Amino acid sequence: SLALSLTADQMVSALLDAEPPILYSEYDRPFSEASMMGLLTNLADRELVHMINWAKRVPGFVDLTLHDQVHLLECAWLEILMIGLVWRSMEHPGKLLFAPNLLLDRNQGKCVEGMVEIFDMLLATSSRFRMMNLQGEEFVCLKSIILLNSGVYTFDHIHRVLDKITDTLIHLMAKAGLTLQQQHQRLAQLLLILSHIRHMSNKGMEHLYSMKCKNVVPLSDLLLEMLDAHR
Amino acid sequence: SLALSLTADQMVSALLDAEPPILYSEYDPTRPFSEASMMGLLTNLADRELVHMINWAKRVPGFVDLTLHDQVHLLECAWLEILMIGLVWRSMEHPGKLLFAPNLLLDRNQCVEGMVEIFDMLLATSSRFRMMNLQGEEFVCLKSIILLNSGVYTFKSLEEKDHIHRVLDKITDTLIHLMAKAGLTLQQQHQRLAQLLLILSHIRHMSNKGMEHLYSMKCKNVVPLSDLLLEMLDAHR
Amino acid sequence: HKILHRLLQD
Amino acid sequence: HKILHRLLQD
Numbered sequence: 157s158l159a160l161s162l163t164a165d166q167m168v169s170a171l172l173d174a175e176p177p178i179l180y181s182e183y184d185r186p187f188s189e190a191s192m193m194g195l196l197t198n199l200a201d202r203e204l205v206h207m208i209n210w211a212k213r214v215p216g217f218v219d220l221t222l223h224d225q226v227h228l229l230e231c232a233w234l235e236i237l238m239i240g241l242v243w244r245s246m247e248h249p250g251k252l253l254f255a256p257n258l259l260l261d262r263n264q265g266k267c268v269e270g271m272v273e274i275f276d277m278l279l280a281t282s283s284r285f286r287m288m289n290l291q292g293e294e295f296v297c298l299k300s301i302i303l304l305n306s307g308v309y310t311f312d313h314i315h316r317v318l319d320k321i322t323d324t325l326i327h328l329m330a331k332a333g334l335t336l337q338q339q340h341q342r343l344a345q346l347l348l349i350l351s352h353i354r355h356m357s358n359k360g361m362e363h364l365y366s367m368k369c370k371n372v373v374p375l376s377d378l379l380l381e382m383l384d385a386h387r
Numbered sequence: 388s389l390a391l392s393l394t395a396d397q398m399v400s401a402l403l404d405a406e407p408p409i410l411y412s413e414y415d416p417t418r419p420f421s422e423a424s425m426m427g428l429l430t431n432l433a434d435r436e437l438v439h440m441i442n443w444a445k446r447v448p449g450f451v452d453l454t455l456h457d458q459v460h461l462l463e464c465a466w467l468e469i470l471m472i473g474l475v476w477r478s479m480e481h482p483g484k485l486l487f488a489p490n491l492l493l494d495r496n497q498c499v500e501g502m503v504e505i506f507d508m509l510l511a512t513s514s515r516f517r518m519m520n521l522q523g524e525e526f527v528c529l530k531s532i533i534l535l536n537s538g539v540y541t542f543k544s545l546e547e548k549d550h551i552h553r554v555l556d557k558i559t560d561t562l563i564h565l566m567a568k569a570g571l572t573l574q575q576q577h578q579r580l581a582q583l584l585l586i587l588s589h590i591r592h593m594s595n596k597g598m599e600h601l602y603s604m605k606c607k608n609v610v611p612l613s614d615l616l617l618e619m620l621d622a623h624r
Numbered sequence: 625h626k627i628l629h630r631l632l633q634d
Numbered sequence: 635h636k637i638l639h640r641l642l643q644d
């Protein structure tokens with residue numbers, strides 16, 4: 157497997173290059189709350205397509221069986237969207253940057269029943285990243301980790317790759333000048349945030365199901381099949 | 388504000404001394420098994436463990452320094468996570484089996500409904516710990532991390548949040564301290580540290596599913612749920 | 625008020 | 635079968 161033979165710099169560069177683009181929402185005001193769920197789900201559906209091409213570019217992911225790739229993406233796709241959302245919301249405190257033309261605040265969450273809670277949690281994660289001064293290089297490592305880790309205990313190469321990324325994360329902190337103590341502390345802080353992103357994703361799937369069962373908000377077959385995988 | 392003044396070894400011994408006991412179930416190999424009765428055994432056990440967990444939480448360094456309201460929130464978020472990691476820890480030397488209690492050891496031919504996926508996930512976690520050769524000293528660290536971490540991002544004067552993070556950092560130090568003491572290289576320590584914390588994501592995931600099933604069990608109104616369990620469950624909804 | 629509250633308070 | 639299968643192969 158080519159992944160394990162990469163240096164830390166080579167790992168980073170390969171991950172930055174694989175970064176999916178920032179998509180835009182549909183244009184045109186106050187949000188209905190089926191208008192808003194439409195926009196979001198439509199955005200999530202188009203992002204999923206780019207996520208699948210990003211995933212194939214994550215070192216070591218191509219070395220997996222198609223079925224193992226399917227499983228990891230099905231398990232982690234909402235987490236991966238969320239950490240993306242949280243990431244590009246960093247420089248917008250109090251705001252969630254779903255798209256450059258779709259910046260939402262907690263207030264607009266109330267439109268959808270039980271959307272305020274995730275808004276708060278997502279906002280919490282964002283400010284946390286902000287106050288941690290999360291670098292883009294650390295972010296792409298964290299997002300890769302989610303992809304490989306989240307579905308792994310629902311199935312050995314993967315763990316070797318996970319170590320590789322850990323090596324890269326530590327390598328990135330040492331270069332930033334952090335002391336030894338500060339390095340493992342920051343590593344720990346980052347990885348603990350992944351438990352919360354997992355938590356947010358699980359609450360997320362719950363609402364998607366009940367939104368599907370209502371059939372008021374249009375969901376793409378792709379989104380539906382991703383949703384089905386969690387049941 | 389003691390917790391921040393403890394050396395790594397004093398941290399460990401303190402945590403080791405606070406360890407709750409292994410309780411017994413009321414399992415009778417006389418009595419014929421059923422989905423309802425077996426589930427009642429598990430929820431009964433869980434309820435009794437909860438009482439010990441609450442008093443174990445008070446002995447976790449830094450925890451008592453928190454407001455009562457914050458203590459309540461942290462336990463409500465983390466209790467099932469803590470039960471689950473306790474389960475998979477004492478199940479380590481029983482490959483393919485989950486030691487809920489010394490007299491209740493399940494291979495997950497149990498059967499009962501909707502619980503298959505987890506015995507598998509709990510077994511995977513348990514076996515994972517076994518391959519890593521997790522130590523008791525590392526275990527009590529992980530458990531304390533879950534207590535303080537699982538509820539931190541749903542909890543404004545904010546320095547209770549900072550104090551908790553300061554305690555978490557201190558526990559991170561204690562984990563590395565142990566791994567270095569075990570002869571691991573620097574690279575090895577970071578890797579092991581990461582591997583351990585990533586498993587906490589799966590435990591979070593298992594717990595989330597846990598609360599889901601517990602809700603359905605409540606609404607199906609067959610398996611008896613204690614008042615404390617129902618209150619914790621209401622906390623999550 | 626909560627059981628968890630009282631036990632913790634004890 | 636699965637949309638995800640097609641997208642991963644393309």
Ligand SMILES: C[C@]12CC[C@@H]3c4ccc(O)cc4CC[C@H]3[C@@H]1C/C(=C\c1ccccc1)C2=O
Pocket residue numbers: 196197199200203237238240241254270271273274356359360361363364
């Ligand atoms: C899944 C989601 C809609 C799509 C959202 C999304 C879209 C694009 C993107 O880049 C990121 C995200 C993150 C959040 C996703 C929404 C979560 C959600 C419902 C929900 C409700 C309560 C609690 C958590 C999630 C939803 O309904």
Ligand SMILES: C[C@]12CC[C@@H]3c4ccc(O)cc4CC[C@H]3[C@@H]1C/C(=C\c1ccccc1)C2=O
Pocket residue numbers: 429430432433436470471473474487501502504505593594596597598600601
């Ligand atoms: C909550 C649980 C019953 C109690 C179990 C338990 C009891 C004692 C203990 O020390 C640990 C545990 C951990 C697992 C607990 C069971 C989880 C569960 C249902 C369930 C179903 C699917 C997925 C996750 C959880 C259950 O119904």
